[PDB]
Amino acid sequence: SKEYHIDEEVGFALPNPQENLPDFYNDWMFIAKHLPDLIESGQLRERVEKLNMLSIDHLTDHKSQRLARLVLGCITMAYVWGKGHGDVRKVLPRNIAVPYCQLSKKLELPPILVYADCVLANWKKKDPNKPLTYENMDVLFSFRDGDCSKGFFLVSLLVEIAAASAIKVIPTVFKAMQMQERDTLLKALLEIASCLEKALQVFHQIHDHVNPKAFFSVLRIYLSGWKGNPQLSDGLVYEGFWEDPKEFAGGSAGQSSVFQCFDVLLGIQQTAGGGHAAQFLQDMRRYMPPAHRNFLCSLESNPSVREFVLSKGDAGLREAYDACVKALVSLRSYHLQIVTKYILIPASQGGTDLMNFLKTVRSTTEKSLLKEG
Amino acid sequence: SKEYHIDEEVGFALPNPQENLPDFYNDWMFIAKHLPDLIESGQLRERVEKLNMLSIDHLTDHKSQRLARLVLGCITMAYVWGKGHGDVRKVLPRNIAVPYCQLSKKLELPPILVYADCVLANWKKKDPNKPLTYENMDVLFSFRDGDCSKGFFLVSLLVEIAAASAIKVIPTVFKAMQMQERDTLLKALLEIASCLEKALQVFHQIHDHVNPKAFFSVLRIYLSGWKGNPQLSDGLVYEGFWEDPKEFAGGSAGQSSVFQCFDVLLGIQQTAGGGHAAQFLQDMRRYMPPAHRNFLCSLESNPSVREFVLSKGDAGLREAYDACVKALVSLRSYHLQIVTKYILIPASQGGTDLMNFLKTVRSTTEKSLLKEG
Ligand code: HEM
Numbered sequence: 001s002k003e004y005h006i007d008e009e010v011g012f013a014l015p016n017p018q019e020n021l022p023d024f025y026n027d028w029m030f031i032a033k034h035l036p037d038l039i040e041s042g043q044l045r046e047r048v049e050k051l052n053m054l055s056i057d058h059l060t061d062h063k064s065q066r067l068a069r070l071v072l073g074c075i076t077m078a079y080v081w082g083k084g085h086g087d088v089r090k091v092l093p094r095n096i097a098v099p100y101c102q103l104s105k106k107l108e109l110p111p112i113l114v115y116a117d118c119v120l121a122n123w124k125k126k127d128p129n130k131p132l133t134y135e136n137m138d139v140l141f142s143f144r145d146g147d148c149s150k151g152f153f154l155v156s157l158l159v160e161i162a163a164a165s166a167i168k169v170i171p172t173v174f175k176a177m178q179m180q181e182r183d184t185l186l187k188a189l190l191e192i193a194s195c196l197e198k199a200l201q202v203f204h205q206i207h208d209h210v211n212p213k214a215f216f217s218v219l220r221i222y223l224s225g226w227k228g229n230p231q232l233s234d235g236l237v238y239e240g241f242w243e244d245p246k247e248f249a250g251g252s253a254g255q256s257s258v259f260q261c262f263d264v265l266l267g268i269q270q271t272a273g274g275g276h277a278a279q280f281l282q283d284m285r286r287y288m289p290p291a292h293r294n295f296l297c298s299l300e301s302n303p304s305v306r307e308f309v310l311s312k313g314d315a316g317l318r319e320a321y322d323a324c325v326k327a328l329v330s331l332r333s334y335h336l337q338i339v340t341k342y343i344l345i346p347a348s349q350g351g352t353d354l355m356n357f358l359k360t361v362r363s364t365t366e367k368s369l370l371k372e373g
Numbered sequence: 374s375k376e377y378h379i380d381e382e383v384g385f386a387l388p389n390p391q392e393n394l395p396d397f398y399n400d401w402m403f404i405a406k407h408l409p410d411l412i413e414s415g416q417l418r419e420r421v422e423k424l425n426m427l428s429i430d431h432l433t434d435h436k437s438q439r440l441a442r443l444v445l446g447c448i449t450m451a452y453v454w455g456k457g458h459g460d461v462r463k464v465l466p467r468n469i470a471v472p473y474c475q476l477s478k479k480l481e482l483p484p485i486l487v488y489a490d491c492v493l494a495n496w497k498k499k500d501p502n503k504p505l506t507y508e509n510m511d512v513l514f515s516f517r518d519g520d521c522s523k524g525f526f527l528v529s530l531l532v533e534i535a536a537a538s539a540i541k542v543i544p545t546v547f548k549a550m551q552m553q554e555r556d557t558l559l560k561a562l563l564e565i566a567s568c569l570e571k572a573l574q575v576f577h578q579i580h581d582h583v584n585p586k587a588f589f590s591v592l593r594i595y596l597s598g599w600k601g602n603p604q605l606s607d608g609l610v611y612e613g614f615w616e617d618p619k620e621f622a623g624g625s626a627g628q629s630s631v632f633q634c635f636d637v638l639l640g641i642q643q644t645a646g647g648g649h650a651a652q653f654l655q656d657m658r659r660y661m662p663p664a665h666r667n668f669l670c671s672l673e674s675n676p677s678v679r680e681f682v683l684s685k686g687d688a689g690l691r692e693a694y695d696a697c698v699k700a701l702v703s704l705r706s707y708h709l710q711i712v713t714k715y716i717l718i719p720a721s722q723g724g725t726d727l728m729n730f731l732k733t734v735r736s737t738t739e740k741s742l743l744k745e746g
Pocket residue numbers: 152155156157159160203206210215251252253254255256259332335338339342343354357358361362
């Protein structure tokens with residue numbers, strides 16, 4: 001893989017994300033760096049209006065434009081939701097909305113905060129010579145103090161990285177159905193299932209670095225979007241760029257390319273049929289960075305690893321395939337238990353809707369098991 | 374173009390659809406082939422309810438699966454809507470629901486009748502040695518006597534095929550862009566406009582073979598589906614396959630790859646924001662064969678033909694590209710005239726939503742012209 005922007009260490013993550021912009025954009029940076037205080041002391045909105053409609057033309061490298069997106073995306077959340085408890089803005093200042101939409105169009109992503117922004121691009125190592133681990137790592141932005149947003153963002157990223165180990169064997173698998181090499185394929189599927197089993201370990205860390213109550217009271221606010229949102233029913237107005245309100249969806253790990261590309265690899269009927277779930281997940285592809293959506297595209301047009309395996313009447317082969325499917329059921333099964341703790345309960349002091357979505361995706365995964373006959 | 378399943382001469386249409394099934398399946402063929410007589414005599418349902426569960430395992434190749442889908446899809450519409458004076462069936466008998474659904478799953482299509490069924494796979498040459506012309510062609514199934522379904526399907530299909538020739542030239546377009554080959558690119562763009570222009574002469578045939586009254590009051594019922602339909606608010610029950618009612622959209626030529634493909638190639642933004650029109654056309658992609666779905670998808674991963682033309686300050690290129698865009702505008706403007714005669718007019722002797730839709734799509738196409746006028 002090359003023009004798909006998949007790092008070999010860091011998979012779908014942005015390889016070594018920028019921390020600072022051209023100082024020509026200090027107005028922007030300062031707000032973002034101080035988002036907890038500004039939101040708390042209501043001076044946030046006040047400052048966004050204060051700013052000047054800057055030009056995105058002083059952003060030369062991809063890496064810098066991604067940071068800008070994460071910067072603007074973050075401000076935009078805080079401006080719309082404010083302190084979080086109801087005072088919602090329906091118009092976005094031209095001085096921030098025009099540059100944001102211009103940069104967004106340039107990048108083929110929607111002008112709203114997206115997984116690829118605040119997980120894949122929103123991080124650094126504390127020490128550059130120690131390894132990519134939780135304790136050697138930090139985020140670049142949070143919404144509130146004690147919003148638990150480091151735990152959430154980093155544990156996500158860590159899983160994204162555990163996954164890259166498997167993404168590297170994706171071409172091996174394709175070449176092996178091609179060259180008809182059965183022994184290589186089996187090894188390859190095994191390597192994959194192994195990598196996905198390790199990524200279940202990483203998941204456990206959620207419990208260590210995220211508190212249910214802080215998580216649910218706070219992070220939920222800043223992940224909401226303006227598509228099927230009661231609080232903004234018509235969508236949002238981007239002053240300057242759009243005449244009308246536009247509906248864009250809030251944050252979803254459905255936007256992760258890791259789990260979408262395994263669904264596709266193993267030919268899990270993830271986006272076929274037409275239940276809400278298959279719809280939604282398809283839409284989230286338009287909220288992935290173009291090269292990743294393209295990479296998904298290319299896998300779908302290769303031929304089905306499920307079909308191959310199905311058609312070969314080779315039990316050992318069947319079993320490698322099942323190892324994979326089983327591993328992916330564990331992840332989703334663990335993720336659901338996490339959702340009970342960090343969402344279902346806190347909400348007991350909307351949600352079942354989210355459960356149904358999860359269970360449906362988990363179910364489809366499970367119905368993919370081969371030796372279920 | 375390789376196994377995007379696009380024919381040299383027939384494009385997205387099925388190359389030589391099979392008219393007959395295996396003998397094992399005569400009980401299906403009988404009903405399908407006599408839909409108009411069974412409905413009218415009030416004994417279609419009973420003939421269906423009296424049917425054996427049949428395995429799909431004697432349908433071995435793609436063509437016969439596609440045929441079987443056509444057969445079962447027709448029966449389903451017939452069974453559900455009966456005569457369409459309002460006595461709906463909300464539950465699809467196991468002996469039908471189950472195979473249809475299995476086959477649908479095997480072909481990654483929703484289990485409801487689609488454009489790829491009724492149009493792309495529902496035809497035959499009368500004399501094989503003679504060319505593809507209305508006169509030399511017939512459909513395999515219709516629903517009522519004087520439904521004009523023949524004229525409807527056959528003329529769409531001729532339009533479809535007319536645009537085939539333009540499809541052949543897509544690869545040349547991409548090759549010419551990257552080789553930086555200005556004269557060739559010009560020739561190819563002109564060549565595409567030529568095909569779209571001719572596809573419009575084809576569209577004229579609609580008047581000769583479809584009658585407004587019958588089209589509106591008869592065909593419209595069997596093309597209706599169960600997504601957001603007041604008559605089936607929760608959708609259909611596919612008996613013995615889903616412990617739940619499923620919502621699927623009725624036939625839409627939004628499911629035609631052809632018009633979506635040129636929208637993509639030309640960089641017309643048929644996903645302008647999250648506007649209803651945009652979302653809907655995206656939805657309809659899921660109701661197309663997967664090969665064809667991939668094709669649209671992989672076009673989106675090539676460099677914009679539009680960016681390339683805007684960047685080059687070449688009047689003769691801008692006019693070639695504009696000719697292509699005009700041609701589409703024409704088709705769509707003719708199509709609205711046609712909608713007026715065949716739906717708005719009968720309608721008044723709901724339909725305002727169809728207009729908004731079509732008008733938005735026309736409008737989007739128009740705002741794509743480089744010369745503003
Ligand atoms: C506090 C911890 C977490 C909570 C409360 C949580 C909650 C949820 C919820 C509610 C959804 C539903 C989709 C949506 O609303 O858009 C979801 C989807 C998802 N989450 Fe999480 N999540 C957590 C951590 C993680 C982590 C660390 C990952 C790993 C990258 C992850 C991966 C996913 C994926 C891939 C989906 C998409 C659905 C699927 O493929 O099964 N989540 N999450």
